[PDB]
mmCIF file of N, CA, C and O and ligand atoms in Angstrom:
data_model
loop_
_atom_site.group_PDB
_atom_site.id
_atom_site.type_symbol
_atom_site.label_atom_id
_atom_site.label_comp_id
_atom_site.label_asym_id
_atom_site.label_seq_id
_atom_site.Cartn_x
_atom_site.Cartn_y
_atom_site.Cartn_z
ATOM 1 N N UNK A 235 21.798 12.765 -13.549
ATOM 2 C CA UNK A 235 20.392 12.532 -13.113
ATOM 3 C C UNK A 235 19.739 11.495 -14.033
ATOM 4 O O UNK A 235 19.173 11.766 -15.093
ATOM 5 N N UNK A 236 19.886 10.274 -13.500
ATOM 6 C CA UNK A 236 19.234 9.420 -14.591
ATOM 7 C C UNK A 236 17.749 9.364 -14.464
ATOM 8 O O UNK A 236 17.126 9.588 -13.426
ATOM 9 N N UNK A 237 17.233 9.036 -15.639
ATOM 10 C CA UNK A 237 15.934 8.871 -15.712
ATOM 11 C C UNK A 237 15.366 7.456 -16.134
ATOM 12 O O UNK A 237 15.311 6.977 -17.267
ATOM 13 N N UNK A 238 14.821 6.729 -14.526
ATOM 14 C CA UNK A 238 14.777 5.158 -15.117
ATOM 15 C C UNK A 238 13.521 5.249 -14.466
ATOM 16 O O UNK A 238 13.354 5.981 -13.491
ATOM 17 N N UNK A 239 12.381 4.343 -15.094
ATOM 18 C CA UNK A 239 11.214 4.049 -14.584
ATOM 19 C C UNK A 239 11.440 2.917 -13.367
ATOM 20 O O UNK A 239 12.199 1.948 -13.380
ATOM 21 N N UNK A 240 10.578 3.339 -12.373
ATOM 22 C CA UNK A 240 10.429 2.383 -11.156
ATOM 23 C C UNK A 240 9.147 1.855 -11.555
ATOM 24 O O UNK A 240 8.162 2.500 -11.912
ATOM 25 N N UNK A 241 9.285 0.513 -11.444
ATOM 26 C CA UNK A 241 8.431 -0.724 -11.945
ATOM 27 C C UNK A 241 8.742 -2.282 -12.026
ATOM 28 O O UNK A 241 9.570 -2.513 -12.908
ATOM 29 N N UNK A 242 8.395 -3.180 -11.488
ATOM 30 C CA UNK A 242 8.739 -4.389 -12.336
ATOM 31 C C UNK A 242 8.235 -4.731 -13.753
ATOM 32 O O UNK A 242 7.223 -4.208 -14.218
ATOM 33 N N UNK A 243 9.105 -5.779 -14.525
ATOM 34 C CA UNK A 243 8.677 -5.919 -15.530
ATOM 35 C C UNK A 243 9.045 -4.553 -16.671
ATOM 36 O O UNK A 243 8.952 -4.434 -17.893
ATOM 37 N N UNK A 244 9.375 -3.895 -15.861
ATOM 38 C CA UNK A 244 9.524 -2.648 -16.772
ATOM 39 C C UNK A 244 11.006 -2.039 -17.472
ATOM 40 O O UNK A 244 11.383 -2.101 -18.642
ATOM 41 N N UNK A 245 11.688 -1.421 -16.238
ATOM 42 C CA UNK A 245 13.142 -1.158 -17.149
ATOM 43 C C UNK A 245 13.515 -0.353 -17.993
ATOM 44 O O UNK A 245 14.340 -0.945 -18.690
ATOM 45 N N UNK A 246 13.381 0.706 -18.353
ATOM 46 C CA UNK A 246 13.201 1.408 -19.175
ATOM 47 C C UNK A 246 13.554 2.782 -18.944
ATOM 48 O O UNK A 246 12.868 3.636 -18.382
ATOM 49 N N UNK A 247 14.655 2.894 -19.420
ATOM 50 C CA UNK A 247 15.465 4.330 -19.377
ATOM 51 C C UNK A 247 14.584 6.083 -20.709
ATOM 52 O O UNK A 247 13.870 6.082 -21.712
ATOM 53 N N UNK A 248 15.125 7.014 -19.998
ATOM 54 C CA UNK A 248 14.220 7.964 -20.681
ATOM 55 C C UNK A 248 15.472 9.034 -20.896
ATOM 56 O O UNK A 248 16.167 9.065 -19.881
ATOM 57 N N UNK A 249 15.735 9.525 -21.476
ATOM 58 C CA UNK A 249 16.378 11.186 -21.600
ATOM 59 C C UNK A 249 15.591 12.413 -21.278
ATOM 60 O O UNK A 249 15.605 13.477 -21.897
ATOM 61 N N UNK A 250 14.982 12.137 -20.333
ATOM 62 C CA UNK A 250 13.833 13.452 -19.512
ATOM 63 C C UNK A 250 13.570 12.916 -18.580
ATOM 64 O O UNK A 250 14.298 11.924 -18.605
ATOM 65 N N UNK A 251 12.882 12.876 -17.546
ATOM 66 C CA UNK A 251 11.712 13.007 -16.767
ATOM 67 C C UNK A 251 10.602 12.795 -17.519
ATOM 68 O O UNK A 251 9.947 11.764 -17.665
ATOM 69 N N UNK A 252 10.440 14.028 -18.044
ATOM 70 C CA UNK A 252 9.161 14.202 -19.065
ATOM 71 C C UNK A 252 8.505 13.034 -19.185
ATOM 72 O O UNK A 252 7.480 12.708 -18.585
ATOM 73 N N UNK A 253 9.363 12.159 -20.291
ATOM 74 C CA UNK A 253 9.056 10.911 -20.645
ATOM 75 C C UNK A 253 8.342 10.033 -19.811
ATOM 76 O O UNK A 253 7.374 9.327 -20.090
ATOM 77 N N UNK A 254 8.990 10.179 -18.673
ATOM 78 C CA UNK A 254 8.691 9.048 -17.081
ATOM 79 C C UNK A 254 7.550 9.518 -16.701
ATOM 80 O O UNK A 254 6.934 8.689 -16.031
ATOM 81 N N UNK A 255 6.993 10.527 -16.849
ATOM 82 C CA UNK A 255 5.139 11.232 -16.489
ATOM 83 C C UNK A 255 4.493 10.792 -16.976
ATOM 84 O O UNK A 255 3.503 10.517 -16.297
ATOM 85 N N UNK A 256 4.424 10.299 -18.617
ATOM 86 C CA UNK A 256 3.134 10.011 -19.317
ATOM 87 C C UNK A 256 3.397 8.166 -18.960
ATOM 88 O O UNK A 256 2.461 7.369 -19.021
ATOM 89 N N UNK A 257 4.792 7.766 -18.609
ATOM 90 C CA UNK A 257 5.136 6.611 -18.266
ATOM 91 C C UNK A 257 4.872 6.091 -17.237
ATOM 92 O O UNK A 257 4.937 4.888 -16.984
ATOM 93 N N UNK A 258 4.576 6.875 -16.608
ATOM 94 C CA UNK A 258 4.107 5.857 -14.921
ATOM 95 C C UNK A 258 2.337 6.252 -14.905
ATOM 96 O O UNK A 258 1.692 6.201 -13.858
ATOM 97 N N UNK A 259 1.873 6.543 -15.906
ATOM 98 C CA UNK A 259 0.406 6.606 -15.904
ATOM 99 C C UNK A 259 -0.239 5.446 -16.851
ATOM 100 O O UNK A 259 -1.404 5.123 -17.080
ATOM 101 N N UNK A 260 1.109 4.925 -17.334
ATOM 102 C CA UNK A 260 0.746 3.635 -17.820
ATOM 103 C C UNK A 260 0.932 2.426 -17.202
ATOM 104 O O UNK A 260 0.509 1.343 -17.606
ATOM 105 N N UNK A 261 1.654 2.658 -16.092
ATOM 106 C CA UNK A 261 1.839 1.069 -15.069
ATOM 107 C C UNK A 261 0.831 1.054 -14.356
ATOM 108 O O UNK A 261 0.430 -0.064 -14.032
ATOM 109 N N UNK A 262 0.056 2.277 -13.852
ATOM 110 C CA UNK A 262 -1.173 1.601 -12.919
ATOM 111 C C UNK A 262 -2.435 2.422 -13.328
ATOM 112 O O UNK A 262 -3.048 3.123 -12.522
ATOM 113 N N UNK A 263 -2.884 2.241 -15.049
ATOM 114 C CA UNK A 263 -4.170 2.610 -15.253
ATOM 115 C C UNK A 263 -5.583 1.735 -14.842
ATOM 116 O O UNK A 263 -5.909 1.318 -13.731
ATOM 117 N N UNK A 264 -6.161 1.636 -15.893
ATOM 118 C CA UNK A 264 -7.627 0.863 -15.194
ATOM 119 C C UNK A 264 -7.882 1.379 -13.985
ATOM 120 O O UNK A 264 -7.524 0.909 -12.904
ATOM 121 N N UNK A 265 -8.705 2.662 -14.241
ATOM 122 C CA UNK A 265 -9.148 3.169 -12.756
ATOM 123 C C UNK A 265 -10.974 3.522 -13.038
ATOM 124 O O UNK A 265 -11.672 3.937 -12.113
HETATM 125 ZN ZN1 ZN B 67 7.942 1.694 -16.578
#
């Protein structure tokens, strides 16, 4: 079960999930 962020520009492998939660609240902040 890999854990890779979906994003351009991005790329970025995780050893959780976990990781990828606080991580995809950083590709589309400014709200
Ligand atoms: Zn990412």
């Amino acid at each position: 079960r890999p854990f890779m962020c979906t994003w351009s520009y991005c790329g970025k492998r995780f050893t959780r999930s976990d990781e990828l939660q606080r991580h995809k609240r950083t590709h589309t902040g400014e709200k």
